[PDB]
Design a protein around this nucleic acid. Structure first.
Lengths: 49, 96, 103, 94, 48, 310, 90, 96
RNA sequence: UUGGAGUAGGCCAGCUCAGACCGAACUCAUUUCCUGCCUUUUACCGGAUGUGACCGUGAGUUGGCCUGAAAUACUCCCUAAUCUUUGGAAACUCUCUGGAUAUCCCAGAUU
């Protein structure tokens, strides 16, 4: 019974369509604009060490 | 030499020179941005030997080697050093 | 069942066989390379035997392209049936089995 | 030949040395396995709980004690003050 | 293949029997041009 | 070694798959190879003349674990981890149709070479499926309690040999939907089930790295075993390694996890060959069906080796 | 539901001007040039050499034959290659 | 009878810089009674048009990699939506 | 009129092919010449000749995402009132012709 569960889980993990390359692939998503705003404000004049 | 050996040597030499042409074309004009996101892993079966004193047989290892993601904006990291020429190949006897 | 090679029974018992090309709502058949087959019950009396042999002898005719009306058709019978893959990206080269581990 | 059984069966003659590896520290060869095999074996070694036989209900029970050890997640419809949504940034008490 | 055509070129007249380069550039016919076609009548009989 | 067979080279590579090659087969004529892989494609190669890749089939949403030529040699049969089967026309290169109804990954599949044409699809929902290759719906399905990783159809066309994770080779009757007898001896999951060319013996390799030959004749003693063969270790991957019989039935070949193909004599038991040359688990080891001493190995280093036996 | 003319009647319309041989159910056989044809198989012919089962060989000019009293026409072989027998892809 | 594209009712969308709004002014005959400078400008725009059409290059184009999509494939570039003034201030400060 | 095989829209990404009108729009570089301006040459002048890049475009195909739809739905090709499909039939006899030939029988034709 536990061998059956392990075999089913292993084969679904290996041969599932959701893991065609070994991992779950998502779409490149859009970040909030305040992230870029904070990055640009933080680095500034590039004067800090 | 007959056409078989001649064409075999032609294939071997033109494969080597084609590799050299590919390297020279890569060096001559870089492809603007030098990144490659097709970073396919390489798996290595590594069997350790005995080292640093102890001689117990360590378990053999499976190692995943992946190329590191590089910043596309990074310039060349190191300067070029002008090292003098090494000595030539050992010269032959002078058969006068 | 278009273009299937078919045999047709006619109203007067004749046969019309060949390569059918078309049909309509009135069951009129366009039938190519047609052979008309006729049967007659002959009483072939041999000079030595007093019993006249009853034989349904068979006679042939060729017509070619024909068009029969559905008001004279009886039955429709089967005669006979009528008389992109791209290459791959793989390569092949000679190779050896390498240096086997000497056991 | 030299891949047949009688060729692999014969040993190397002579005595043995009383006193090889591809790299300086051991022997390393290139191998080909599925990604899922390496991930599953690395997970079995890495995860604290690799092995130790366990079904779904007591795993959910361990998840429940782990969840109640953590801080309150908060209410997402409360935008300010006590009860405001903290979410996955809730820390574990220690 | 005329509908796989873009730009001002898809607004051009086909001009099937104008084949001289003078005919193409001047936009008029300079030579006689024969064709043989199978055309159907109203009753359905094809003629040459 | 002098030349033994009619090949361009005594041994040579076939490559071009971008994933692990899980199953490779032969034409019944013995002139065409069809290989399905992890990369959801099927590559069709020509053995003789210039060794040329001449076809690619792309219809499956997941890994293709099996594919079987028909009795004539114009139809290809794919079992795939997208929970489907498929019949392919190898003249236009199109897919004829898909066979739908399995609720898990299909591991095995077999067609009948004698008699009426059927499809034998074992799958991880514990289900054998008997399919007719003209209707998209299954003729029948036998439900079990354990995932099935290897199936085989008999000469008579009424017996199903099914191996799975229950460590038993079960022999079922199609018209009765019941096991006629179980066959024990293995202690890890059965990966292949091949009937001999004469139909007198059964080969079964499993995940305990032991290949067992069994007496299959109807009037047999209580223990239907014959022999056990060692020397083909299964490595780290738990793949479905599939073996084959030679045409005369004298030799058996099983892929190993060391990149080697281990060939034994079916009647004597000696290790006739241990053939290296692969950098991964050899998923398939097949013999040429047209009386030739040719062995094809398909391995998860994305490659196949065509070799001759000298 | 416009009454589409059948392919046999279309082939009969193609056959006008050619030499056709008609076999009737009233026993007559005519070989002649098909001048006029209708959608209900009434045909007007010109040459009409006549042949019956009782051997009524005769020659005359111009005839109107109704489509109910006929069995079948025979038309030239080349009319097999008419454009109506090529499947227009829709 | 309207000129292109006003005689159409469907079409493909073009780049904003690919719409020459006043090109037909100098593709047509110049209005009567212009200054010499305006007529010379008309003739020079005609010259630019004619040289653009005479040197109309169309050789083979091979596999072209897009710069922005290749940068978007990496982890070092993210995407968002901002005001154009904010983007211009960022570009000017970055270049400085 | 039906069957068989099919399954939406939007967006993202890869791959292959397509300038000929890929693009109803328009730059830059460069080989070999000729001209111009020129103390030198980078940068230039403007014609020819090829040759590259760059800003873009379309189709096919593969994978993914988002919102759904949920065996619904959609889809392709395909198969009783006169000229056929709501029967002028059915049955038998006579005569004639042919074979048999003393007849029976039968084929064809006619009533």
């Amino acid at each position: 019974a536990q061998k059956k569960k392990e075999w089913l889980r292993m084969q679904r993990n290996r041969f599932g369509e959701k893991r065609k390359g070994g991992f779950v692939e998502t779409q490149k998503a859009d970040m909030p604009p305040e992230h870029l705003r904070k990055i640009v404000k933080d680095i500034g004049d590039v004067s800090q060490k | 030499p007959s056409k078989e050996e001649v064409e075999a040597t032609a294939e071997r030499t033109k494969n080597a020179l084609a590799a050299l042409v590919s390297g020279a074309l890569a060096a001559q004009k870089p492809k603007n941005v030098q990144v490659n996101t097709k970073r396919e892993a390489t798996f290595v079966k590594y069997t350790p030997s005995a080292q640093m004193g102890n001689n117990t047989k360590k378990q053999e290892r499976i190692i995943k080697i992946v190329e590191r993601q590089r910043d596309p904006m990074e310039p060349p990291k190191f300067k070029h050093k002008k090292i003098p020429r090494g000595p030539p190949s050992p010269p032959p006897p002078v058969m006068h | 069942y278009i273009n299937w090679r078919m045999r047709v029974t006619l109203n007067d018992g004749r046969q019309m066989t060949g390569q059918m090309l078309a049909f309509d709502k009135h069951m009129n058949l366009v039938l190519a390379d047609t052979e008309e087959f006729r049967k007659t019950k002959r009483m072939q009396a041999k000079p030595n035997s007093s019993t006249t042999q009853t034989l349904i002898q068979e006679e042939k005719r060729t017509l070619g392209l024909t068009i029969v009306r559905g008001a004279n058709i009886i039955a429709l019978s089967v005669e006979s049936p009528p008389p992109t893959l791209t290459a791959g990206p793989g390569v092949a080269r000679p190779a050896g089995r390498g240096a086997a581990a000497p056991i | 030949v030299p891949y047949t059984g009688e060729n692999l069966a014969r040993p190397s003659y002579g005595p043995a040395n009383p006193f090889k590896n591809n790299v300086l520290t051991g022997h390393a060869e290139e191998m080909y396995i599925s990604e899922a095999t390496f991930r599953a074996k690395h997970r079995a070694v890495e995860a604290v709980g690799g092995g130790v036989m366990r079904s779904n209900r007591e795993m959910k029970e361990v998840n429940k004690r782990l969840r109640e050890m953590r801080e309150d997640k908060g209410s997402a419809t409360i935008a300010d003050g006590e009860g405001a949504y903290i979410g996955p940034w809730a820390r574990y008490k220690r | 293949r005329l509908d796989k055509r873009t730009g001002k070129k898809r607004d051009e007249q086909l001009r099937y029997t104008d084949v001289h380069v003078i005919e193409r550039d001047r936009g008029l016919s300079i030579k006689a041009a024969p064709m043989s076609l199978v055309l159907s009548s109203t009753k359905g009989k094809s003629h040459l | 070694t002098p030349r033994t067979s009619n090949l361009k080279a005594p041994l040579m590579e076939l490559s071009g798959h971008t994933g692990e090659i899980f199953t490779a087969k032969f034409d019944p004529t013995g002139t065409l190879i069809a290989s399905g892989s992890m990369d959801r494609t099927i590559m069709l190669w020509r053995v003789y003349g210039d060794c040329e890749n001449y076809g690619v089939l792309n219809g499956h949403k997941a890994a293709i674990l099996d594919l079987q030529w028909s009795r004539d040699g114009d139809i290809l049969f794919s079992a795939s981890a997208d929970m489907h089967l498929a019949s392919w026309d190898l003249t236009t290169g199109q897919r004829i149709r898909r066979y739908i109804g399995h609720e898990e990954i299909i591991n095995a599949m077999d067609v009948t070479q004698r008699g009426e044409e059927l499809l034998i699809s074992g799958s991880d929902d514990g289900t054998i499926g008997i399919w007719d290759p003209r209707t998209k719906n299954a003729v029948d399905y036998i439900e079990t309690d354990f995932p099935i990783t290897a199936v085989a159809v008999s000469e008579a066309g009424n017996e199903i040999y099914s191996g799975g994770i229950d460590n038993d080779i079960k022999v079922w009757d199609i018209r009765k939907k019941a096991v006629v007898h179980t066959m024990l001896g293995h202690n890890d999951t059965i990966t292949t089930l091949r009937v001999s060319p004469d139909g007198q013996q059964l080969l079964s390799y499993a995940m305990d790295s032991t290949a067992r030959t069994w007496d299959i004749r109807p009037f047999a003693p209580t223990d239907r075993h014959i022999r056990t063969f060692d020397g083909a270790p299964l490595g780290l991957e738990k793949n479905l390694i599939r073996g084959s019989w030679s045409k005369d039935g004298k030799k058996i070949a099983v892929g190993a996890g060391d990149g080697t193909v281990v060939i034994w004599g079916s009647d004597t038991g000696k290790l006739l060959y241990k053939l290296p040359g692969h950098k991964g688990t050899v998923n398939c080891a097949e013999f040429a069906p047209d009386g030739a001493p040719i062995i094809l190995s398909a391995s998860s280093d994305r490659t196949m080796l065509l070799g001759e036996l000298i | 539901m416009t009454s589409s003319i059948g392919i046999p009647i279309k082939l009969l319309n193609e056959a006008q001007g050619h030499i056709v041989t008609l076999e009737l159910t009233t026993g007559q056989t005519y070989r002649g040039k098909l001048i006029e044809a209708e959608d209900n198989m009434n045909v007007q012919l010109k040459d009409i050499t006549v042949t019956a089962r009782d051997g009524r060989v005769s020659h005359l000019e111009q005839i109107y034959i109704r489509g109910s009293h006929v069995r079948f026409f025979i038309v030239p072989d080349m009319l097999r290659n008419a454009p109506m027998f090529r499947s227009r892809n829709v | 009878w309207a000129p292109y594209p006003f005689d159409r009712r469907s079409g493909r969308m073009v780049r904003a810089q690919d719409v020459p709004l006043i090109k037909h002014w100098y593709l047509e005959h110049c209005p009567p009674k212009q200054p010499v400078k305006v007529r010379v400008s008309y003739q020079k725009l005609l010259k630019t048009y004619v040289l653009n059409e005479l040197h109309r290059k169309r050789p083979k184009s091979m596999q072209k990699q897009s710069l922005l999509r290749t940068l978007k494939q990496t982890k070092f570039f993210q995407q968002t939506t901002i005001d154009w003034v904010e983007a211009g201030l960022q570009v000017c400060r970055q270049g400085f």
